[PDB]
Every structure is written in structure tokens, then in C-alpha cells.
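worker-3 :: picked divalent cation transport-related protein
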Amino acid sequence: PPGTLVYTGKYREDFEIEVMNYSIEEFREFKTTDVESVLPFRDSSTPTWINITGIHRTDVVQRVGEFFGTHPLVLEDILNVHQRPKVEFFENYVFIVLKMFTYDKHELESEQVSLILTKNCVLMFQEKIGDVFDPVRERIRYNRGIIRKKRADYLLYSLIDALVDDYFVLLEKIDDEIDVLEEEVTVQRTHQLKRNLVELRKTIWPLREVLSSLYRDVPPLIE
Ligand SMILES: CCCCCCCCCCOC1OC(CO)C(OC2OC(CO)[C@@H](O)[C@H](O)[C@@H]2O)[C@@H](O)[C@H]1O
Ligand SMILES: CCCCCCCCCCOC1OC(CO)C(O[C@H]2OC(CO)[C@@H](O)[C@H](O)[C@@H]2O)[C@@H](O)[C@H]1O
Ligand SMILES: CCCCCCCCCCOC1O[C@H](CO)[C@H](OC2O[C@H](CO)[C@@H](O)[C@H](O)[C@@H]2O)[C@@H](O)[C@H]1O
Ligand SMILES: CCCCCCCCCCO[C@@H]1OC(CO)C(OC2OC(CO)[C@@H](O)[C@H](O)[C@@H]2O)[C@@H](O)[C@H]1O
Ligand SMILES: [Mg+2]
Ligand code: NA
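worker-3 :: C-alpha cells ->
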């Protein structure tokens, strides 16, 4: 059937759902491979982060979408790793597509991460285990800052902020390495490593340009 949902990416080894539900006074977290156990949180009056790792499980993605009222067109986008980053506003929910690097001491993998803010839930969809969101998990666990007091829109902002922070750290590491090569480090191979890094840097740099543009120009317009 043409309408068949297809995962377009290359990761198929992991599957797991992690739920963190909290309010100013409490917090409960669990991991499960049973999707039926996370569906009840749909109607939660308090914020719930539902992190679905392994979107190759198109059956799980479809079940979550059907229960939460996600449009099939959005499930196609979640499953298509060639989507562009975006924020899109549906009558009853916000849909966001992001990209995220996974780091390990060149070379660096890229993975798409989608978010849906619906009612009081942030649904997160990842391709494989491993992400940049631990700082947010810890602030929830240990009741740091104000995240525990705020609603699910703040959870959404906090997760995006964690990804922004990761990119800025990543650009800093890329710059420190280019420097190391530029002033140090036989010569012909050293130069081609540099090229590799300056290209990766060119890929990430637009994020900083978009953010700096918003930061500089919006606030005064708001006044
Ligand atoms: C649209 C909805 C969602 C929006 C979410 C909000 C996005 C927030 C972006 C801001 O994060 C940063 O704030 C800085 C200041 O402008 C940074 O400079 C800095 O980077 C550091 C972190 O390593 C520290 O050395 C200092 O805080 C230093 O000011 C930079 O790191 C960056 O991470
Ligand atoms: C990268 C950019 C991302 C931008 C994200 C934008 C976030 C938008 C959410 C803000 O507005 C809302 O916040 C709620 C909790 O999350 C609400 O609960 C609600 O408020 C109501 C009563 O006023 C009713 O409409 C419903 O019960 C509804 O769920 C409702 O105010 C909703 O519109
Ligand atoms: C604050 C939010 C982010 C700010 C900074 C934005 C950084 C640049 C974003 C662009 O990323 C992409 O560019 C495409 C196209 O321009 C993609 O679609 C596509 O997939 C391809 C490659 O994956 C292309 O070959 C196709 O033409 C097709 O359009 C897609 O992969 C996506 O990753
Ligand atoms: C407000 C926060 C917003 C955060 C989101 C915006 C991030 C800015 C874009 C940077 O990340 C990319 O998107 C890809 C798709 O995930 C890439 O494709 C890739 O580049 C390659 C070429 O070497 C392959 O090796 C990789 O596997 C991979 O598919 C990756 O290079 C880079 O273009
Ligand atoms: Mg689409
Ligand atoms: Na991941």
C-alpha cells in the first residue's frame, strides 16, 4: 500500500520508551518497551516527557500517533530523516523537527529528533539510544532551576535549549581543533583533516547565525 509508513533512516538496533512525569511536588520516571503503558499519560494534567527511541518501529510510532491524534502526514515527517528543521503549528499541537549530533572523541553521527507538544505532553522521537538531553533529565530528577514548576511548553523550550548548548559546545571543540592544526600539528595529511573540520563547521554555523539574528533583532521590535 502506498500509504504505508516507512522509516527512511539507517538505525534499527534500539527500541525503548522513557517516561518522566512531574509537577512542583513530585516526579516519576520509568523505561518500557510496552507502548500501551505510556498512552495513559496523554490526558495527564501535569507535564510528561515521553521519549520514544527507535522510530524504525513504525508500528509503535503509528500507535502513538493514532492515540494522540497526530496527523498521518506528521508521522511521515517524523519517519523521514531528510526533513528540514522546522516548527509547524497544528490546531491542537506543535510539531518540531531537529537534528542532533552524537559525539565520540571526526567522526560524528547525525540523527533526526522530532518533538510534539500536545496537551501537557512532549512526545520525543529519536532514531537510536544516545542524546544531549541528560542535563534536562537531571534538573527534573533533582529539582534544579524552575523546570519542575513550569508547564510542558517550558519542557519543550528546555529540551531545545539543551540541543542549542550542545551545538555551541561542539563548535567550540571544532574551533579548538582547527587551531591545534593551524598552528601545529607529514604536512599534506594535516591540511586535509582541517578541510574536514571546516566543512563540518560550515554545516553547523547557520544555527548560530539564525540564533544570533533572532537575539539581536527581535527584542527591540518587541519594544
Ligand atoms: C525558540 C524556543 C526555544 C528557545 C530555547 C532558548 C535557546 C537559548 C540559547 C542561549 O544559550 C546560550 O547562552 C549564551 C549567552 O548568550 C551562551 O554563551 C556562553 O556559553 C557558556 C556555556 O558553555 C558559558 O561560558 C556562558 O554562559 C557564556 O555566556 C551560549 O553558550 C549558549 O549556550
Ligand atoms: C519553537 C517554538 C515552539 C513554540 C511553542 C509554543 C507553545 C504554545 C503553548 C502555549 O499555549 C498553551 O499552553 C498550554 C499548556 O501547555 C495550554 O493549555 C490549554 O489552555 C486552555 C484554556 O485556556 C484550553 O485552550 C486547553 O485546555 C489548552 O490545553 C494552552 O494555553 C495552550 O494554547
Ligand atoms: C533554528 C533552526 C535551524 C537553523 C539552521 C538551519 C540549518 C540548515 C538546515 C537545512 O537542513 C536540511 O536541508 C535540506 C535541503 O535544503 C534537507 O531536505 C532534503 O534532503 C536532502 C539531503 O538530506 C536534499 O538532497 C533534498 O534536496 C531535500 O530538500 C534536509 O536534509 C535538512 O537536513
Ligand atoms: C534550535 C536548535 C535547532 C537544531 C537543529 C539545527 C541543526 C543545524 C544543522 C546541522 O546538522 C546536520 O543535519 C544533518 C541531518 O541529520 C546532516 O547530514 C549528514 O551529513 C553527512 C555527510 O558527511 C553524513 O555523514 C551524516 O550521516 C548525516 O546524514 C549533518 O551533516 C548536518 O548537515
Ligand atoms: Mg512531509
Ligand atoms: Na538518539
